[PDB]
Amino acid sequence: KIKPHGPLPSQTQLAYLGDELAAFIHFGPNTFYDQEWGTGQEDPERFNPSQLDAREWVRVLKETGFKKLILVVKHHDGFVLYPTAHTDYSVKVSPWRRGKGDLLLEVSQAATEFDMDMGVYLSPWDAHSPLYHVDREADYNAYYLAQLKEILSNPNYGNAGKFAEVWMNGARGEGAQKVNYEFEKWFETIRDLQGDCLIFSTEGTSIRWIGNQRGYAGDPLWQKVNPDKLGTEAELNYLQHGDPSGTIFSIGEADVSIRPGWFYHEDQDPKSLEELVEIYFHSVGRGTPLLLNIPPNQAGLFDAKDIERLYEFATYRNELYKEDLALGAEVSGPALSADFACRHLTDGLETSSWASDADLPIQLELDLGSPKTFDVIELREDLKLGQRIAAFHVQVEVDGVWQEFGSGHTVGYKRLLRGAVVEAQKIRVVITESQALPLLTKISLYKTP
Numbered sequence: 544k545i546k547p548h549g550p551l552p553s554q555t556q557l558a559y560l561g562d563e564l565a566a567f568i569h570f571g572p573n574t575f576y577d578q579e580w581g582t583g584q585e586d587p588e589r590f591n592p593s594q595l596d597a598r599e600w601v602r603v604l605k606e607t608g609f610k611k612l613i614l615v616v617k618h619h620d621g622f623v624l625y626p627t628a629h630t631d632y633s634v635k636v637s638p639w640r641r642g643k644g645d646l647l648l649e650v651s652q653a654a655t656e657f658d659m660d661m662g663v664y665l666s667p668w669d670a671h672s673p674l675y676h677v678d679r680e681a682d683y684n685a686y687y688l689a690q691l692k693e694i695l696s697n698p699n700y701g702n703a704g705k706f707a708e709v710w711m712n713g714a715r716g717e718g719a720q721k722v723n724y725e726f727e728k729w730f731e732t733i734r735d736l737q738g739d740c741l742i743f744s745t746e747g748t749s750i751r752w753i754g755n756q757r758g759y760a761g762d763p764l765w766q767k768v769n770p771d772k773l774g775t776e777a778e779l780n781y782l783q784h785g786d787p788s789g790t791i792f793s794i795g796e797a798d799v800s801i802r803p804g805w806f807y808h809e810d811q812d813p814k815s816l817e818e819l820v821e822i823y824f825h826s827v828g829r830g831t832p833l834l835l836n837i838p839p840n841q842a843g844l845f846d847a848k849d850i851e852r853l854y855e856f857a858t859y860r861n862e863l864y865k866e867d868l869a870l871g872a873e874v875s876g877p878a879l880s881a882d883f884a885c886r887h888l889t890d891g892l893e894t895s896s897w898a899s900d901a902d903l904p905i906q907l908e909l910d911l912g913s914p915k916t917f918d919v920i921e922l923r924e925d926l927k928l929g930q931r932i933a934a935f936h937v938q939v940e941v942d943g944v945w946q947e948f949g950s951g952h953t954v955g956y957k958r959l960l961r962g963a964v965v966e967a968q969k970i971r972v973v974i975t976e977s978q979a980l981p982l983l984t985k986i987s988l989y990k991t992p
């Protein structure tokens with residue numbers, strides 16, 4: 544029994560890491576006003592999608608491999624997209640669904656049908672609320688809290704009444720009131736109603752921002768931080784790389800829009816497959832989830848181009864992973880014991896892993912038995928026992944010379960590392976720095992389609 548190392552992830556954290564792909568939905572007055580930020584002066588009469596179909600949103604997301612859907616139900620403009628008891632600035636005063644509309648309900652019903660996990664984004668900064676003022680901040684905090692209770696206590700909201708993530712955006716306009724939030728109170732309520740539900744915030748919660756909206760996790764990416772170095776003034780590079788000395792397990796979620804903007808704009812186009820693939824390799828392929836925003840249009844529908852792109856992106860990933868070229872390769876090198884043997888890295892069993900207490904560098908060598916053509920290696924740690932590896936490199940034997948394939952810092956939950964396409968039978972993975980005796984659960988090899 545190897546001892547754990549460092550801060551360990553919760554079950555809900557590991558489940559997210561396992562799921563890899565989440566979808567964001569920004570939709571609201573901003574969609575009708577052709578803007579990215581609203582003022583709270585938007586006319587609810589203009590919130591009037593011609594033919595909204597949340598079931599179609601959920602179906603396409605499910606079919607294209609997304610495992611969670613995070614819905615904006617109140618952006619910075621403050622317009623609430625479910626019939627809240629706590630402000631009149633909501634869908635209640637919109638003509639949509641002859642005034643009886645509830646977008647949270649509509650998305651929740653569809654998500655429940657498709658077993659799509661649910662997140663909810665409720666903007667802390669509220670440009671509409673007359674309570675959003677330093678002189679009224681206790682009242683604003685009670686407003687926000689009361690809405691968390693409305694959202695998170697209702698069996699008709701979420702995936703069968705369950706929410707997997709709450710999103711508290713850190714953004715605030717320069718001229719806005721400097722309201723301070725009752726974070727701990729909010730977190731307690733979230734726990735009371737939804738247990739270990741993940742929380743994205745500027746504070747020391749289970750999810751942090753990766754520090755850009757480009758889909759780029761750093762290398763290294765430590766999925767752990769010290770809460771004392773977070774808050775609204777957290778350094779972006781700290782978010783992006785995490786902390787080798789972090790004290791809490793923290794997922795650096797990589798959010799990015801399929802378009803330039805978060806809301807739908809007719810004049811904008813979605814990213815290319817090539818662009819999404821790069822993002823994929825620098826987010827999921829660096830051990831963190833990708834949260835990809837798809838904005839519905841003024842009809843309440845996903846854009847046709849955007850839909851095509853999600854299917855092409857899904858096809859790409861299915862083809863990448865179709866064959867693990869490393870399965871059954873003979874693996875040699877040091878190993879702690881038979882229970883942690885090298886052959887565990889390519890045996891195709893999720894239940895078996897490798898470890899070694901040998902002095903670094905530790906060299907694992909795979910012999911594929913015959914020459915194969917590949918351009919991706921996948922490594923995974925056992926984060927139930929903590930993140931450990933700080934540096935590694937990969938080589939391939941070509942005409943009797945061990946040439947470089949690639950190098951990196953961290954592995955984490957899952958690390959994809961691309962190299963130039965090669966035909967080779969023998970590969971070395973060399974671990975050169977680690978915070979504790981290294982473990983890997985798998986080595987895989989693929990060819991990009």
Ligand SMILES: CC(=O)N[C@@H]1[C@@H](O[C@@H]2O[C@@H](C)[C@@H](O)[C@@H](O)[C@@H]2O)[C@H](O[C@@H]2O[C@H](CO)[C@H](O)[C@H](O)[C@H]2O)[C@@H](CO)O[C@@H]1O
Nearest residue numbers: 569579580619711712713714715744745752755756798805
């Ligand atoms: C329009 C725009 O680019 N705004 C960004 C801010 O993004 C916010 O978050 C995204 C997801 C979207 O809802 C925007 O309308 C929001 O304004 C950005 O705020 C940071 O956003 C990240 C998430 O990407 C975390 O929530 C941070 O805590 C926020 O500080 C700010 C600063 O990067 O830049 C523009 O205002």
